[PDB]
Design a protein around this ligand. Structure first.
Ligand SMILES: CC(C)C[C@@H](CO)NC(=O)[C@H](CC(C)C)NC(=O)[C@H](CC(C)C)NC(=O)OCc1ccccc1
Length: 212
């Protein structure tokens, strides 16, 4: 695989979003992976609905938290709508997938990257964007303005984000806290520390949507 990977350079990632004051991270995270694989497969880049996931995922807790893998399961079964058809409100209402009409896209499945393994993660990122979790509760993470982030931080993961690339010494992450945070909404986290958990727990649980 390559030394450098950046899905933005292949026209596979959409503008940085802001989840606001709602624990929708898991939905935003899954959506980045969906927008990415569809572009890679079909050639078109569209924004998909995080609100739909927020409302229609029964295994997740709406704005109280949720699971990227379950949100990714939902799309592989029932598909998903465009963000424009089913916009983001920052509050969980009721599932309106049927009302909005036919789904815009549907995935074929979801797979898990072998955990606590930097190589297994890089390999997957070289194929498509990946849903990844980390600990964002630390002040250092919250105050990040740029650079290859090395911490300090623990591995009490509590925020789902998406990995859209990597380099010799970092993993490029797309966050959902707006463009005013980090490097225009992005963060480059240190890799190859030999830490199996990954910086901030980055290697705890990673999933990606499958689509043939
Ligand atoms: C509720 C969890 C299980 C799910 C995750 C992912 O959404 N939640 C979160 O990550 C939550 C979101 C929500 C509660 C406002 N994050 C937060 O509440 C954090 C702040 C807290 C920890 C002091 N949000 C936060 O810090 O806002 C972003 C920001 C900070 C500094 C500069 C620019 C932008």
């Amino acid at each position: 695989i390559p030394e450098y990977v950046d899905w933005r350079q292949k026209g596979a990632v959409t503008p940085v979003k802001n989840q606001g004051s709602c624990g929708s991270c898991w939905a935003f995270s899954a959506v980045v992976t969906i927008e990415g694989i569809i572009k890679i497969r079909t050639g078109n880049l569209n924004q998909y609905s995080e609100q739909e996931l927020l409302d229609c995922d029964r295994r997740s807790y709406g704005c109280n938290g949720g699971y990227p893998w379950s949100a990714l399961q939902l799309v592989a079964q029932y598909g998903i709508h465009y963000r424009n058809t089913y916009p983001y409100e920052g509050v969980q209402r009721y599932c309106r997938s049927r009302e909005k009409g036919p789904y815009a896209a549907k995935t074929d499945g979801v797979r898990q990257v072998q955990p606590y393994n930097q190589g297994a993660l890089l390999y997957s990122i070289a194929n498509q964007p990946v849903s990844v979790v980390l600990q964002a509760a630390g002040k250092d993470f919250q105050l990040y303005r740029g650079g290859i982030f090395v911490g300090p931080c623990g591995n009490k993961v509590d925020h789902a984000v998406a990995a859209v690339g990597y380099g010799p010494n970092y993993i490029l992450i797309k966050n959902s806290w707006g463009t005013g945070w980090g490097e225009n909404g992005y963060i480059r986290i240190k890799r190859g520390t030999g830490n199996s958990y990954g910086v901030c727990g980055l290697y705890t649980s990673s999933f990606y949507p499958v689509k043939n």
